[PDB]
């Protein structure tokens, strides 16, 4: 929660790609789980949403964006679809995972990737 | 609107190859996964594989990786699914289901199915 | 792994049934993400349920899923004739689905 940092289309390359080490970005929207092309397939109801976010960081650093607020950053990177958890290892991206998952599963991500 | 059909019923020989096709409609291809299941008599069914559309990433069944080979084509909307070293096991009416899976797991539209019958 | 399911059940118009879903592994959990496919006559399918609970866009808000005790489930409050089909589950685990036996839900 204080370990969030919101982000902005030209606040890009100076919070997240510049950066010590390993940094993460939940592109959320509060459309927890709907997709981007067509806007008319999606669904509000759904609750697997996952704020497990406020928890692995407390466990390197993650950041959080929202595309209906920030429609400039997404389609940069082609994403087709939310969630996804873009890994930005030395301002690159070394993997991406679609389709959540519990905290058990974001472990299996993570600690095949860092160390 | 949605809509998945397949191709007609084959008759293939055993050690040959077959490809059945997928034609997607009614929503963009690249945002759905793309299942593909096996339903034999008394056997209910049988998970083959999953592909993304968008990239083409693949995860198969432990049973099924030296079998199936899924791929997609974005053009024409077609998913596809290449049974090789066909035998008399492999005789079952395949389907193709969608999954959403952004922020979750759940089918929702599915094939009529095709009938193969691997004869000699 | 080996997903389980009833064999048959039996229920009436107006009536609540419940079916279940056991995995041998252990108990199913928020991970397994069950889901839940319909086979009416003539090998019509669609899917109703997954994820343990989230339903497809169109379909009947009756069909209700939870995780009762060790095992996923299914509940049809107040059963339709046309819920006459056989109800498949689907259990996934290391990124790999396993489907189950199937349960013959007959409507009188």
């Known amino acids: 929660s204080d370990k969030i940092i919101h982000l902005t289309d030209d606040s890009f390359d100076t919070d997240v790609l510049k950066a010590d080490g390993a940094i993460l970005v939940d592109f959320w929207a509060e459309w927890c789980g709907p997709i981007e092309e067509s806007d008319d397939r999606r669904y509000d109801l759904v609750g697997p949403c996952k704020m497990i976010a406020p928890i692995l960081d407390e466990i390197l650093t993650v950041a959080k964006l929202n595309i209906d607020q920030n429609p400039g950053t997404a389609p940069k990177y082609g994403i087709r679809g939310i969630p996804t958890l873009l890994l930005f290892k030395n301002g690159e991206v070394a993997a991406t995972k679609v389709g959540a998952l519990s905290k058990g599963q974001l472990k299996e991500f993570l600690d095949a990737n860092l160390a | 609107e949605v809509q998945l059909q397949q191709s007609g019923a084959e008759l293939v020989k055993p050690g040959a190859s077959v490809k059945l096709s997928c034609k997607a409609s009614?929503?963009?291809?690249?945002?759905?996964?793309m299942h593909w299941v096996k339903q034999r008599p008394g056997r209910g069914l049988e998970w083959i594989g999953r592909?993304?559309?968008?990239?083409?990433?693949?995860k198969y069944n432990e049973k099924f990786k030296s079998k199936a080979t899924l791929t997609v084509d974005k053009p024409s909307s077609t998913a596809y699914m290449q049974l090789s070293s066909l035998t008399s096991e492999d005789s079952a009416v395949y389907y193709c289901?969608?999954?959403?899976?952004?922020?979750?797991?759940?089918?929702?539209?599915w094939g009529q199915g095709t009938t193969l019958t691997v004869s000699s | 792994a080996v997903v389980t399911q009833e064999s048959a059940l039996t229920t009436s118009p107006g009536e609540t049934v419940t079916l279940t879903c056991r995995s041998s592994?252990?108990?199913?959990?928020?991970?397994?993400?069950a889901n839940w496919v319909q086979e009416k006559p003539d090998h019509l399918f669609t899917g109703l349920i997954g994820?343990?609970?989230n339903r497809a866009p169109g379909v009947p808000a009756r069909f209700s899923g939870s995780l009762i005790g060790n095992k996923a489930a299914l509940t049809i409050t107040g059963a339709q004739t046309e819920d006459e089909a056989i109800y498949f589950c689907?259990?996934?685990?290391?990124?790999?689905?396993?489907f189950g036996g199937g349960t013959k839900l007959t409507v009188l």
């Open positions: 289901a969608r999954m959403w899976y952004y922020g979750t797991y759940y089918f929702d539209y």
């Open positions: 009614g929503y963009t291809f690249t945002s759905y996964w």
């Open positions: 592909i993304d559309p968008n990239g083409g990433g693949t």
């Open positions: 592994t252990g108990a199913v959990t928020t991970s397994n993400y």
């Open positions: 994820g343990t609970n």
């Open positions: 689907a259990l996934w685990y290391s990124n790999h689905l396993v």
